Amino acid sequence: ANVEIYTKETCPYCHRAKALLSSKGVSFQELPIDGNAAKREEMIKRSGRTTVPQIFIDAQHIGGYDDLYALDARGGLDPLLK
């Protein structure tokens, strides 16, 4: 599954999403913005937001933890990730 999450040093909702994904025990990628700028610009073209957490599930930009956790709440996260 193609899963990516942009993050930073101080992002409580990043920790929220990652804690759920580690409870599910899925395989995902993390993308730090900590000192970054060129891949933060990448996140402009990708997300159209430039804020975090911003999860992408099978390259599909979901949005943040609440958006992701809703995708889990509908049982729709699992058939993409697992």
From Swiss-Prot:
Native source organism of the sequence: Escherichia coli (strain K12)
Sequence similarity: Belongs to the glutaredoxin family.
CDD domains to which the protein is assigned, alphabetical: GRX_GRXb_1_3_like
Record-level GO BP terms: cell redox homeostasis; cellular response to oxidative stress; deoxyribonucleotide biosynthetic process
MF terms in GO: glutathione binding; glutathione disulfide oxidoreductase activity; protein-disulfide reductase activity
Source taxonomy: Bacteria, Pseudomonadati, Pseudomonadota, Gammaproteobacteria, Enterobacterales
Keyword tags: Deoxyribonucleotide synthesis, Disulfide bond, Electron transport, Redox-active center, Transport
GO annotation, cellular component aspect: cytoplasm; cytosol
Record protein name field: Glutaredoxin 3
Pfam families: Glutaredoxin (PF00462)
Transmembrane segments: none
InterPro entries with a match to the protein in the record: GLR_AS, Glutaredoxin, Glutaredoxin_subgr, GRX_bact, Thioredoxin-like_sf
UniProt domain Glutaredoxin: residue ranges: 1-82
